[PDB]
Amino acid sequence: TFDQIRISLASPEKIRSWSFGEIKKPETINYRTFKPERDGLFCARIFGPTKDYECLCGKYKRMKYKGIICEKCGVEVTLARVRRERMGHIELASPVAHIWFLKSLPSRIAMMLDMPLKDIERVLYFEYYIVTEPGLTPLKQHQLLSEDDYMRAQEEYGDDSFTAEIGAEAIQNLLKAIDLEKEAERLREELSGTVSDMKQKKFSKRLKILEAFQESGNRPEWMVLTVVPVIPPELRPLVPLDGGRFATSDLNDLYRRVINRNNRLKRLIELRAPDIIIRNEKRMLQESVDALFDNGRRGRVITGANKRPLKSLADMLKGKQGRFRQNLLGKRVDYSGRSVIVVGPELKLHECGLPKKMALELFKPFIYARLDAKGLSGTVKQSKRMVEREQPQVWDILEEVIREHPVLLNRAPTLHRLGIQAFEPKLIEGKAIQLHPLVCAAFNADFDGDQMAVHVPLSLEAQLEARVLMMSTNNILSPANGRPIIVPSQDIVLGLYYLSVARDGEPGEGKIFADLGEIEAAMDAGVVSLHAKIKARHTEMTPEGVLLRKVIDTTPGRMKIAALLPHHPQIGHRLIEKALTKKEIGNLIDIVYRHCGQKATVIFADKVMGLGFKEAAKAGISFGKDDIIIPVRKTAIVEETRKLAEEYEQQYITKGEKYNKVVDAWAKATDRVADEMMAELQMKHKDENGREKEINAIYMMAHSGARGSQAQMKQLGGMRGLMAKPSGEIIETPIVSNFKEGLTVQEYFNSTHGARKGLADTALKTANSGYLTRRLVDVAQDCIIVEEDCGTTKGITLRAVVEGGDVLVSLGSRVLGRFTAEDVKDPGTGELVVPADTYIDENIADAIEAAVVQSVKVRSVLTCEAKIGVCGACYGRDLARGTPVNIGEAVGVIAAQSIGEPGTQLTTGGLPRVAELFEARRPKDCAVIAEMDGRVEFGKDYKNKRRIKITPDKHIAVHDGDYITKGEYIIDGNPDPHDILRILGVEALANFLVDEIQEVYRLQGVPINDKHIETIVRQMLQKVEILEPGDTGLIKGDHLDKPEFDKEQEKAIARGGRPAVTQPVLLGITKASLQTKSFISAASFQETTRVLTEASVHGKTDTLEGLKENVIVGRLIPAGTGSYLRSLQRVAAKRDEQLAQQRE
Amino acid sequence: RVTVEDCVEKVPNRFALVLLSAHRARGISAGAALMVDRDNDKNPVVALREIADDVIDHEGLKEHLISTL
DNA sequence: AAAAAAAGAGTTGACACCCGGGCGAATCCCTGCTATAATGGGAGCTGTCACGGATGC
DNA sequence: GCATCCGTGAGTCGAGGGTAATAAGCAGGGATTCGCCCGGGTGTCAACTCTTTTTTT
Ligand SMILES: [Mg+2]
Ligand SMILES: [Zn+2]
Ligand SMILES: [Zn+2]
């Protein structure tokens, strides 16, 4: 095992200790015989033998001994795995500077000894000469004589007391002569008692880097490395491809070039070449060294044969082969398959069809184990032969093994957590994976060409864990909001709507039926129609006991689906009186699941699906040409509008005429024909016999809400309005036509323009949604419910949204699911309707909604002040299940997934607006808040800006005479969040951000709970600044746990002096992971260059607490099952310690 | 063949139930299942069905299994 | 009621042979030496923003 | 205190299958490498002597 991963600078001694031998010859392999070389990159003596238990030269190939070493050959006998864990080092004749600590964004070497980055580049390139150790003569230290005349002509002051060096040796000597304690003590005194105008910005960074280099234990001279280690000969393979043509990695080229340049420099130093040639050799060697690491900072190094740039070690870990999505996080998985999906109505809700071909391959080891235990086979090898020939007896074993083993099915674009749902496989013919019609709505994938992957859990614990945690029957409620996701999409809802409709004119009306069997028998004979006014006997059980089966007057279509409803109060035949709209049927599944259990809900959803399909297949839902009708008044409305628009053209300013003639004549005419066709379609025709002939197909499809809409029907039968050009404005030409009649090419060109614009818009906005989802998951990945109760009494006020005289969201729906912070009092009447701290159930919800009440203080995750993590007493009721959230459940990941789910359908607001709001950047130049009170004083005397107005006791929209108070919204739209949090409290900024995000998400018509936004806002604010110099002279931001831990320790050391308090600081979600504690979580999403070089000098040790670290290391995630197992291990360790204490 | 409704009602954690059922199945793999019949069921399903009519506070054995080395 | 031998062990010479280690021989790699006069180099963007930061007077 | 210039980002699963160009010469001496063959340790067999479990007397 291993814990507390630590990363820091590697000294030359450590590099020599890691290496086994030094490479001197750049010879990969021989051309006649393919074997390793003596000192080449691929050496057996340095990187172990190539074969397993077989040394070279055919002397100790017996493989019986592993500790012997071949004398003549020179390599020991060892497995091939040792060739991957052996490294080599390269000796350098001259020192070279690291490319990461030189060309990075913050100049690490320039921060030391106050050296500009422009001057260090001149010394490394051997252009100028730096002077050190100055005497009484001129040319003081750090002179940096540029011209050579100053090095020779100006050097006429004696050959002593004057030292000048050039190249990497100068930087090495400067880093070796620099001191840490003296510089830190000098910077500490200068920081205190200083104006702090511009010198502080560099002094703080210098003090930080010095204190990091001091406590970390890394000397400053390790930056200029002297020896470079080589990767083992297993990550840069040279496997021969088919045909005799080898294929090596691009890493061998860099090492070969470095070795060649080093050998050339060594030969130059021995031959005593001139300084001009030796200098160029050192320059080329240093360039090769600092290009072998990054290859992007300096000039690009491209091979002469291939036209693509070489991939160095830095570029190999950034986006392509790094731990982002290639190897660490996202990797290939076996025991899986892929195939197209189809719809199956006979299958249950928890059963999915699986082809025999895929099941036979995925469950091969299970079939082998069954054949071994059943006794029908003998040797394992023999068994492998039985399934190969596909004997008929193996089919019985496959059906027995696949009985309760759940398989995981997931679509390609896994947006939300519902994309992965386990099922029970059932053998079926064909090659298409069967699926359930109700479960397809959760995956968000049509059956046109989509394909789904299948996985198989091998472990017994993982198999049993997916049955009670990831089964499709358990995922019936959406995690974003409490809305059922098993609502009928297209056909079941249409059938239920067709059955719910009641017509007064029908045969067999007025008769009384006791049982539904009599109704069915009458319908079989044809005496009674499908739906007509009928009084029958039905039981309701409203008093929670037994009912006398009171007679009810409803059509035969009604009370046939109502019989499937479970027996329970608050539900019955009274709820089926509606027209059974899609929204109504969706609301019906919520009440049945809320009142009764989960089994009744799933069984009712299964029963209603078959009835809807059986009823839809019996009626004439066929869409025809006569179903769509155009209003007869449109032919006159369009001609009247054309005649009216003619007079406007002859009158004409052309801009005003063209603008007013198109938004008044065509806009009013477009809405007139729309309502005309709507009234003509909604009208119920009366047949001569006296009964309704039939209902329109498109009208029913639009009213049910399954597929049809208002705009679609309007464009199909109406006038289509006016099209918009790609510039943005609307064309003045009237497109008066519909899809039923012919369309000329001119009016079709504008429609094509609009369609192409929409298609190009929808293709780019979806990538931004994925980027935002990937960015939000990394900032809220550390939020896990660890504690049950926190004991916090604080809370945030919650109010309902209102626009004018109507409310958008009810107060009961917004406050529902959260624990009440304080006891709410009934307005007017002195009665306590809710206790101080109690769970707000549906009964309490509609009780608070019935009696009018103002905002109530409710506990939230943002007001919690518990330990690391989040408690269950502030999150509230879970959204996936009715019961409260359990301990160990990941809240940040589900919140990020729910925030990213409604994306790709948005748009001054929308997706870019949400991305800018979450980042908390500068929206635009807005008036700063006055943050004053009482009398307001003038600002600045026209100094290009108004800094602040003091009252001790640009376009301006507020008068100086009027009084100003703290919190006045003297600002244009889109105010800045930084000054808002600086002046007002954190609760105000949180409420403002929540309101903005909720408005941006509701403008499109997507409901989202404010709990996820509150969790994201809490994850944003985690650092606090420092204003007092007590125990910490720095002013930079720090994690919230350090002052809570440092202030308690500082007060215990000495109460004297002064405390330390500072207001919190806000930062975007992107920078929230920049300064995170664990560098592994930051190196995954952000750039690996700035994260590694910054954490390398400081030497931060990762504790493997976050979820991202455990996934990379391959351990149990600290969430849910992992959290419970860790708690059990902790209690077991405590019990063991208690038992060992008594035993001494 | 059995829902997790009664299982969640017995243990509201919904996470310890998985470990408890896994331990119950590991114990039923050899010399167990004297409380509820198989009824043509596998180990995990039979363990989940037995948990609905068994003592939920049986994690003492699971804790003692990893108590010492 | 008695009493010795084909196997079962145990060797004893009698080949058959199969890579190992030398003796050769045939042949690879390195290195340097050539004497009219040779005297500064060829792509590559340039049809995304936007942010977030690093230099300068 | 601002104006100008250099790093990061861009979803995700699937298909599709291999590649490609320049080109001095010869003389000295060693290290390397492939063929044959004697050979001593490893196998594969004719063929000479104690023991004994009965099967026969
Ligand atoms: Mg599709
Ligand atoms: Zn060897
Ligand atoms: Zn709390």
- Indicate if CB(A326) is under 7 A from strand C: no
What three-state secondary structure class fits A90? strand
How far apart (Å, rounded) are the C-alpha atoms in residues A721 and A715?
A: 8
| Residue A871 annotated as lining a ligand binding site | yes
- Indicate if CB(A117) is under 7 A from strand D: no
Taking the CA of residue B4 and the nearest CA in chain A, the distance in Å comes to 6
DSSP state for residue A221 in the 8-state scheme: G
What's the Cα-to-Cα distance from A261 to each of A306, A436, A616, A1073, rounded to whole Å? 22, 66, 80, 41
How far apart (Å, rounded) are the C-alpha atoms in residues A298 and A245?
A: 33
Looking at A272-419, which runs of residues are DSSP E strands?
A: 336-340, 351-355, 407-410
How far apart (Å, rounded) are the C-alpha atoms in residues A455 and A414?
A: 15
Nearest to A461 among B7, B22, B42 (CB): B22
Please answer yes or no on whether A460 and B26 come within 8 Å at the CB atom.
Answer: yes
What is the residue whose two structure tokens read 């190897």?
A: A327
Distance A46 CA to ligand 2 centre (A): 14
| Residue A294 annotated as lining a ligand binding site | no
Q: Which residue of A has its CA nearest to B16?
A: A1124
CATH number for the domain whose boundaries are B4-66: 3.90.940.10
Distance A782 CA to ligand 3 centre (A): 16
- Indicate if CB(A330) is under 7 A from strand D: yes
DSSP state for residue A88 in the 8-state scheme: E
In chain A, the N- to C-terminal Cα span, in Å, equals 27
Q: Hey, what are A280's tokens?
A: 């160029």
| A583: number of Cβ within 10 Å | 12
How far apart (Å, rounded) are the C-alpha atoms in residues A848 and B37?
A: 49
Which residues of chain A neighbour B68 with C-beta distances below 8 Å? 1136, 1139
Distance A993 CA to ligand 3 centre (A): 21
- Indicate if CB(A118) is under 7 A from strand C: yes
Domain ranges (residues) in chain B: 4-66
How far apart (Å, rounded) are the C-alpha atoms in residues A571 and A554?
A: 16
A7: CB partners within 8 A, 6+ apart: A1079, A1092, A1095, A1096, A1099, A1100, A1101, A1102
How far apart (Å, rounded) are the C-alpha atoms in residues A91 and A935?
A: 74
Taking the CA of residue B49 and the nearest CA in chain A, the distance in Å comes to 12
Consecutive H or E run containing A686 = none
A1032: CB partners within 8 A, 6+ apart: A1026, A1038, A1046, A1060
- Indicate if CB(A58) is under 7 A from strand C: yes
DSSP state for residue A574 in the 8-state scheme: G
- CA A324 / C1′ D17 distance in Å: 28
Find the CATH number of the domain harbouring A673: 1.10.132.30
- Indicate if CB(A300) is under 7 A from strand D: no
Nearest to B44 among A464, A469, A883 (CB): A464
b/e per residue, A52-81, with b = 16+ CB within 10 A? ebbbbeeebeeeeeeeeebeebebbbbeee
- CA A30 / C1′ C28 distance in Å: 13
In chain B, the N- to C-terminal Cα span, in Å, equals 38
For the purposes of burial, counting CB atoms within 10 Å of the CB of A544, is it exposed (0-12), middle (13-18) or buried (19 or more)? Answer: exposed
How far apart (Å, rounded) are the C-alpha atoms in residues A794 and A871?
A: 14
Helices (H), A573-666: 582-595, 598-616, 634-651, 654-661
Nearest to A468 among B17, B26, B68 (CB): B17
How far apart (Å, rounded) are the C-alpha atoms in residues A360 and A391?
A: 12
Q: Which residue of A has its CA nearest to B21?
A: A464
Q: How was this structure determined?
A: cryo-EM
Ligand with the closest atom to the CA of A341: 1
Q: Hey, what are A576's tokens?
A: 């089926």
What's the Cα-to-Cα distance from A263 to each of A23, A27, A43, A253, A269, rounded to whole Å? 11, 13, 18, 15, 10
| Residue A352 annotated as lining a ligand binding site | no
Backbone angles phi, psi at A191, to 5 degrees: -70, -40
A1043: CB partners within 8 A, 6+ apart: A1024, A1026, A1060, A1062
Distance A472 CA to ligand 1 centre (A): 21
Ligand with the closest atom to the CA of A68: 2
Please answer yes or no on whether A464 and B5 come within 8 Å at the CB atom.
Answer: no
Ligand with the closest atom to the CA of A412: 1
Paired residues of A615 in beta bridges? none
SS3 content of chain A, % helix, strand, coil (to 5): 40, 10, 50
A230: CB partners within 8 A, 6+ apart: A23, A41, A87, A88, A89, A90, A255
Helices (H), A890-974: 891-900, 911-919
Judge whether A605 and A349 are in contact, CB under 8 Å. yes
Amino acid at A1036: K
For the purposes of burial, counting CB atoms within 10 Å of the CB of A330, is it exposed (0-12), middle (13-18) or buried (19 or more)? Answer: exposed
| A346: number of Cβ within 10 Å | 9
For the purposes of burial, counting CB atoms within 10 Å of the CB of A39, is it exposed (0-12), middle (13-18) or buried (19 or more)? Answer: middle
Taking the CA of residue B21 and the nearest CA in chain A, the distance in Å comes to 8
Chain B residues with CB under 8 Å of a chain A CB are 3-5, 7-8, 12-19, 21-22, 25-26, 41-45, 47-48, 59, 62-64, 66-68
| A1005: number of Cβ within 10 Å | 8
Q: Which residue of B has its CA nearest to A886?
A: B13
How far apart (Å, rounded) are the C-alpha atoms in residues A322 and A329?
A: 10
Which bases on strand D have an atom closer than 7 Å to a protein beta carbon? 1-2, 7-15, 18-21, 33
Judge whether A130 and A142 are in contact, CB under 8 Å. yes
Amino acid at A1047: K
Which residues of chain A neighbour B66 with C-beta distances below 8 Å? 1128-1129, 1132
What is the residue whose two structure tokens read 């101080």?
A: A836
Please answer yes or no on whether B3 and A473 come within 8 Å at the CB atom.
Answer: yes
How far apart (Å, rounded) are the C-alpha atoms in residues A481 and A948?
A: 45
| Residue A778 annotated as lining a ligand binding site | no
What is the residue whose two structure tokens read 């359930």?
A: A436
| Residue in B18, B45, B62, B65 to test binding to A, most A beta-carbons within 10 Å | B18
Please answer yes or no on whether A886 and B66 come within 8 Å at the CB atom.
Answer: no
- Indicate if CB(A921) is under 7 A from strand C: yes
Sheet holding A512-513, edge to edge: A512-513, A535-537, A551-553
Q: Which residue of B has its CA nearest to A464?
A: B44
How far apart (Å, rounded) are the C-alpha atoms in residues A839 and A848?
A: 13
Nearest nucleotide to A296, CA against C1' atoms: D7
How far apart (Å, rounded) are the C-alpha atoms in residues A577 and A562?
A: 10
Q: Would strands A785-787 and A870-871 be described as parallel, antiparallel, or unpaired?
A: parallel
